[PDB]
């Protein structure tokens with residue numbers, strides 16, 4: 002019987018009690034990254050994360066930081082591979098920058114051969130060290146030209162441009178890459194990019210945020226989500242029909258959270274909690290498993306929810322070989338009003354739930370996850386058991402999928418000095434406590450989880466936060482980014498992998 | 501009789517001998533700037549100078565500097581107006597960033613009302629202090645979307661997109677702005693943007709520079725130059741036919757140089773010198789005054805030179821109310837081969853001339869203008885009399901135009917400390933020596949020059965050089981850009997203006 006801790010102090014950092022041998026022998030362990038966050042702009046065209054961070058610098062992060070140079074993995078990709086080789090990692094998730102291989106967005110306008118060569122060399126280097134690539138085609142960095150031509154994922158023109166981009170990736174790299182991710186965290190762009198305007202492209206209703214250049218927070222998240230599912234599904238169909246000879250697998254990436262009732266004896270809070278599962282996970286997993294949105298979304302969202310045609314439903318349903326599940330935290334849910342006629346209505350209000358980290362009796366769900374210095378009542382707290390709950394739920398509700406955990410990690414403050422930053426025991430605690438629960442759910446519930454990629458390989462630009470927080474298992478000095486030095490967490494993870 | 505100095509030391513910095521009263525009473529004196537160089541990216545879309553500087557950082561400048569934040573005239577426009585008010589300037593040349601008012605390039609895609617408001621407030625503030633705006637519609641900062649859709653000025657689609665942009669500017673600002681410039685320095689984008697790839701967008705033949713993403717240095721400069729003339733002319737026609745009620749004037753900006761023979765008794769050098777006038781100035785002034793390219797260009801460039809249709813010739817010919825002439829230096833010309841079949845052929849070789857600052861007997865043309873630290877044999881030297889020669893030539897060859905000198909200035913090294921940077925006596929010498937010759941040519945040749953705008957109002961990002969050189973008459977500290985402090989040159993210029 003496996004027992005895992007939920008509260009500090011944790012004791013799972015002792016590799017005598019928890020290590021890679023605790024898991025099946027074929028289980029993949031590694032780390033993850035994304036292109037905007039690590040490469041720099043050298044050698045690529047511009048994308049909407051360059052656009053957004055430069056047009057709205059106070060949204061890029063409190064330091065106004067951006068991905069212009071970051072850790073310079075364009076130049077130092079080899080040092081990334083060396084970190085992985087030090088860890089004895091068997092997997093690495095990275096993303097291809099669309100703007101590096103097709104700077105003009107539309108494939109017919111030409112490809113960047115040097116960009117293609119950059120990824121060829123990375124892939125070859127990973128394979129030579131025994132590292133399996135997990136490659137994200139789209140980690141939010143849409144070529145700016147596409148957002149300016151037709152507002153990107155707001156328009157159905159995105160589908161064929163994304164399809165032609167993916168086809169190029171499969172043709173150039175699919176002989177070596179066998180695990181593809183389509184769109185990173187399906188929920189995020191619709192809500193943050195087109196609802197709250199916290200992320201690129203930065204669209205929203207005028208009274209939500211007067212700085213947005215355009216938008217409608219009540220309708221656009223649904224339009225964008227719908228086009229994401231269609232573009233994803235078109236790419237999966239293309240892969241499965243035209244690249245089956247490569248013997249690979251493809252899937253979407255979901256951001257997952259677990260939800261618990263703010264008051265577990267209050268039927269209204271219990272109902273809000275179930276609505277949150279449907280509106281947060283089911284918005285995408287209903288279409289992916291059944292070709293339809295959840296009925297509660299159909300009922301609440303009404304005319305603002307697009308319909309799939311029979312052909313589209315068939316394309317979307319079953320459009321995955323596996324799921325990349327990212328998991329960071331869990332929230333308590335209580336009822337909240339849904340003012341659909343307010344000018345500041347957002348799609349996020351449709352779930353009729355308010356989310357917190359503290360329940361009605363005052364219990365904080367778990368240890369600190371992210372301090373909010375402007376507002377401490379907005380701190381985020383984590384919940385190790387949530388990874389168990391999420392995986393169990395996906396097996397039970399969503400037809401026993403093959404899963405890879407494609408992101409899991411925690412930040413530390415950018416104000417810490419180097420010594421403090423390297424002594425990242427809070428990161429060991431977070432990673433180990435989640436890995437304990439992950440092993441427990443695999444053993445107890447028989448969830449088909451086959452790998453785990455911790456967020457992040459090294460310190461990088463964090464969307465919305467600049468360089469004010471660090472997520473790496475390896476440390477990068479912003480005054481001289483060449484080296485990636487394993488932190489205590491990286492050193493721990495090395496021992497966990499090879500105990 | 502007016503006597504002006506050509507060599508150090510200069511004595512024209514004494515406002516007892518040379519001041520604004522030396523010129524006609526209506527003569528306009530001020531300074532100039534451009535949007536990419538001073539505003540920052542906040543509040544605007546992305547353009548090809550953001551694209552080029554980020555994709556090719558070592559081409560942005562030796563420090564990899566760019567216009568991301570620069571002197572922050574987005575926030576500190578008022579401080580610009582305060583510099584002008586301190587100088588008692590009567591003119592200011594600035595440019596409108598296309599990407600600030602139409603971030604999506606094509607006007608039908610929507611306008612940025614806040615961007616429009618930014619220029620409204622600047623214009624209103626200048627007029628309230630008695631400063632006449634001279635507004636450049638296009639100072640090289642093409643929206644990136646247009647370069648990605650159709651390669652910008654390489655394609656004739658540019659004409660209508662530029663026309664619709666200009667129409668928006670005339671409609672919103674033309675009730676207050678009475679002096680418009682269309683395209684800054686017509687010669688520069690074709691040659692540096694599409695020939696040598698020193699400037700955005702960075703296209704050239706593969707063997708000229710392997711880093712270019714695409715191009716053809718032998719043909720594209722001519723295509724781009726042709727489209728620039730057509731787009732310019734379409735905008736002038738639009739202005740003169742639809743905005744005549746505003747009672748303003750419009751014209752192009754030329755970069756001018758004078759040319760002298762490397763050996764003034766050698767017929768081959770003399771011929772190369774006359775070819776340079778035609779290929780450098782006549783490339784654009786032939787079309788602007790006669791609707792045709794110079795015959796030497798027709799003969800040499802052959803099938804690589806586009807033809808104007810009769811309708812186009814008529815549109816281009818006479819398409820100016822005045823000329824904005826920029827002037828910095830003069831070169832000696834000697835013959836050089838034109839290897840049209842070489843894979844590294846460039847349009848610039850078609851003139852059959854090699855340019856230097858030293859003549860065949862070893863005479864340097866004038867004082868130092870720009871030190872080149874990698875290569876001292878590549879230093880640039882200036883020649884005060886060249887402004888006299890250029891203005892005389894334009895009056896004689898080009899039908900006695902109305903002229904405004906829209907840029908004239910000199911850099912100092914960015915390595916100098918603040919104290920050294922403020923003690924910019926070499927800038928007083930450069931400005932005064934040119935102003936002496938300008939007054940002399942107006943009096944002796946009766947050239948219709950009606951204003952002078954010195955480059956630059958304040959320190960800014962310099963195309964190709966980052967922040968490694970300074971051109972301002974006012975100093976900006978890059979660690980805290982709010983203030984613009986008049987340097988010795990600014991203080992001199994203040995006394996010259998109000999002696």
Ligand SMILES: *[C@@H]1O[C@H](CO)[C@@H](O[C@@H]2O[C@H](CO)[C@@H](O[C@@H]3O[C@H](CO[C@H]4O[C@@H](CO)[C@@H](O)[C@H](O)[C@@H]4O)[C@@H](O)[C@H](O[C@H]4O[C@H](CO)[C@@H](O)[C@H](O)[C@@H]4O)[C@@H]3O[C@@H]3OC[C@@H](O)[C@H](O)[C@H]3O)[C@H](O)[C@H]2NC(C)=O)[C@H](O[C@@H]2O[C@@H](C)[C@@H](O)[C@@H](O)[C@@H]2O)[C@H]1NC(C)=O
Pocket residue numbers: 287291292293294295296299300308
């Ligand atoms: C898995 O996908 C399956 C579909 O492949 C989901 O089942 C479909 O569920 C929908 C409800 O979402 C049912 O559709 C209703 O059909 C009524 C019956 O119509 C049929 O007979 C008529 C009935 O009187 C008739 O007019 C119609 O022409 C057919 O003859 C409808 O009236 C319902 O429409 C009303 O409600 C809609 C909101 O639900 C609203 O948008 C419509 O305007 C209308 O007010 C609905 O009809 C649908 O109307 C919209 C139109 O665009 C659709 O094409 C039309 O079908 C389906 O009949 C049912 N299909 C079958 C094959 O079962 C399944 O839903 C789950 O299971 C069903 C049993 C139900 O309990 C759902 O609540 C639950 O979500 C999806 N599973 C999951 C887990 O999501």
Ligand SMILES: *[C@@H]1O[C@H](CO)[C@@H](O[C@@H]2O[C@H](CO)[C@@H](O[C@@H]3O[C@H](CO[C@H]4O[C@@H](CO)[C@@H](O)[C@H](O)[C@@H]4O)[C@@H](O)[C@H](O[C@H]4O[C@H](CO)[C@@H](O)[C@H](O)[C@@H]4O)[C@@H]3O[C@@H]3OC[C@@H](O)[C@H](O)[C@H]3O)[C@H](O)[C@H]2NC(C)=O)[C@H](O[C@@H]2O[C@@H](C)[C@@H](O)[C@@H](O)[C@@H]2O)[C@H]1NC(C)=O
Pocket residue numbers: 786790791792793794795798799807
């Ligand atoms: C100011 O603009 C005026 C035009 O508005 C320029 O004058 C034009 O100059 C061109 C030369 O550039 C002369 O065109 C030549 O016409 C010959 C005569 O053709 C007429 O009679 C025929 C002659 O035998 C006949 O086929 C033709 O159909 C007419 O009947 C031509 O053969 C020349 O073409 C050859 O040379 C071209 C290069 O110059 C080459 O590109 C052609 O392939 C061909 O080999 C030329 O014909 C031109 O051919 C190209 C075609 O696209 C043009 O439409 C076609 O005209 C013009 O006759 C002359 N027009 C008039 C109204 O004078 C003027 O040029 C300056 O002045 C003229 C006198 C000449 O000295 C030029 O060298 C000098 O540049 C421009 N001024 C300035 C200062 O640039």
Ligand SMILES: *[C@@H]1O[C@H](CO)[C@@H](O[C@@H]2O[C@H](CO)[C@@H](O[C@@H]3O[C@H](CO)[C@@H](O)[C@H](O)[C@@H]3O[C@@H]3OC[C@@H](O)[C@H](O)[C@H]3O)[C@H](O)[C@H]2NC(C)=O)[C@H](O[C@@H]2O[C@@H](C)[C@@H](O)[C@@H](O)[C@@H]2O)[C@H]1NC(C)=O
Pocket residue numbers: 264265266267268361362
């Ligand atoms: C977890 O949720 C439960 C279920 O909602 C909370 O228990 C309920 O708390 C209500 C108070 O918020 C109780 O109602 C009140 O009962 C007192 C005694 O009769 C009465 O004077 C009140 O005016 C009030 O009555 C309601 O008034 C509004 C009407 O619309 C409604 O019909 C009335 O019910 C309610 O009885 C109680 N329900 C149960 C099943 O116990 C629970 O609240 C926490 O426990 C209750 C026992 C009470 O001690 C609360 O003070 C305490 O907050 C909530 N838990 C937390 C920690 O918030």
Ligand SMILES: *[C@@H]1O[C@H](CO)[C@@H](O[C@@H]2O[C@H](CO)[C@@H](O[C@@H]3O[C@H](CO)[C@@H](O)[C@H](O)[C@@H]3O[C@@H]3OC[C@@H](O)[C@H](O)[C@H]3O)[C@H](O)[C@H]2NC(C)=O)[C@H](O[C@@H]2O[C@@H](C)[C@@H](O)[C@@H](O)[C@@H]2O)[C@H]1NC(C)=O
Pocket residue numbers: 763764765766767860861
């Ligand atoms: C300014 O340009 C002028 C005109 O081109 C230069 O003067 C010319 O310089 C040529 C030498 O580069 C002289 O030709 C030479 O004459 C000597 C004496 O006969 C002879 O031995 C040479 O081999 C050579 O002759 C030429 O050989 C090549 C044949 O294709 C050609 O037909 C021959 O002419 C030429 O006479 C002279 N022309 C004139 C009109 O004086 C001038 O060069 C400078 O001055 C000349 C006098 C001489 O002192 C050069 O050393 C000195 O460089 C050049 N000025 C500068 C400063 O470069």
Ligand SMILES: *[C@@H]1O[C@H](CO)[C@@H](O[C@@H]2O[C@H](CO)[C@@H](O)[C@H](O)[C@H]2NC(C)=O)[C@H](O)[C@H]1NC(C)=O
Pocket residue numbers: 206207216217218219220304305344
């Ligand atoms: C968001 O777009 C929706 C749909 O166009 C707008 O909601 C409509 O508002 C129009 C004008 O009131 C109403 O007539 C419709 O009944 C509403 N339609 C539905 C689908 O709700 C909404 O006003 C726009 N919001 C913003 C802030 O512009």
Ligand SMILES: *[C@@H]1O[C@H](CO)[C@@H](O[C@@H]2O[C@H](CO)[C@@H](O)[C@H](O)[C@H]2NC(C)=O)[C@H](O)[C@H]1NC(C)=O
Pocket residue numbers: 705706715716717718719803804843
């Ligand atoms: C530049 O474009 C020109 C015109 O397309 C190319 O020059 C031609 O080269 C083709 C192939 O040799 C020749 O057949 C033509 O005679 C040339 N045409 C003329 C107008 O010169 C040139 O090769 C291209 N340069 C680059 C480097 O691609």
Ligand SMILES: *[C@@H]1O[C@H](CO)[C@@H](O)[C@H](O)[C@H]1NC(C)=O
Pocket residue numbers: 016017018019020022023500
């Ligand atoms: C690995 O952890 C398991 C418990 O799952 C333990 O039994 C085994 O000894 C550990 N391996 C090492 C080398 O410490």
Ligand SMILES: *[C@@H]1O[C@H](CO)[C@@H](O)[C@H](O)[C@H]1NC(C)=O
Pocket residue numbers: 238239240242243
């Ligand atoms: C498959 O590739 C072939 C050849 O390029 C193409 O005709 C077909 O439409 C492609 N399709 C998909 C997504 O099935």
Ligand SMILES: *[C@@H]1O[C@H](CO)[C@@H](O)[C@H](O)[C@H]1NC(C)=O
Pocket residue numbers: 343345
């Ligand atoms: C608008 O929304 C903000 C946040 O959603 C909320 O605090 C405020 O009450 C809302 N106001 C109206 C008029 O609904």
Ligand SMILES: *[C@@H]1O[C@H](CO)[C@@H](O)[C@H](O)[C@H]1NC(C)=O
Pocket residue numbers: 481483484
């Ligand atoms: C930067 O870091 C690299 C690797 O540690 C080091 O070799 C190089 O000398 C450092 N550069 C400077 C300027 O210190």
Ligand SMILES: *[C@@H]1O[C@H](CO)[C@@H](O)[C@H](O)[C@H]1NC(C)=O
Pocket residue numbers: 089499
């Ligand atoms: C790498 O991991 C493999 C598989 O578990 C192991 O046998 C090998 O010893 C490890 N290497 C190091 C250097 O840890």
Ligand SMILES: *[C@@H]1O[C@H](CO)[C@@H](O)[C@H](O)[C@H]1NC(C)=O
Pocket residue numbers: 515516517518519521522999
């Ligand atoms: C201005 O310069 C002129 C010479 O052009 C001189 O005569 C006049 O006195 C000067 N004005 C002042 C105020 O110094």
Ligand SMILES: *[C@@H]1O[C@H](CO)[C@@H](O)[C@H](O)[C@H]1NC(C)=O
Pocket residue numbers: 737738739741742
């Ligand atoms: C003038 O404006 C009118 C009305 O918008 C338009 O019809 C006409 O084509 C414009 N033209 C130019 C450039 O003359």
Ligand SMILES: *[C@@H]1O[C@H](CO)[C@@H](O)[C@H](O)[C@H]1NC(C)=O
Pocket residue numbers: 842844
């Ligand atoms: C190519 O050009 C460079 C500069 O134009 C020149 O130095 C070199 O000789 C040229 N080579 C050939 C093969 O023409």
Ligand SMILES: *[C@@H]1O[C@H](CO)[C@@H](O)[C@H](O)[C@H]1NC(C)=O
Pocket residue numbers: 980982983
């Ligand atoms: C920056 O310069 C402005 C103007 O001189 C000054 O008022 C402000 O205090 C300075 N900021 C800092 C941080 O020194």
Ligand SMILES: *[C@@H]1O[C@H](CO)[C@@H](O)[C@H](O)[C@H]1NC(C)=O
Pocket residue numbers: 588998
């Ligand atoms: C401004 O220039 C005008 C015109 O020459 C002059 O009369 C006025 O005194 C000057 N003001 C200052 C403060 O120099």
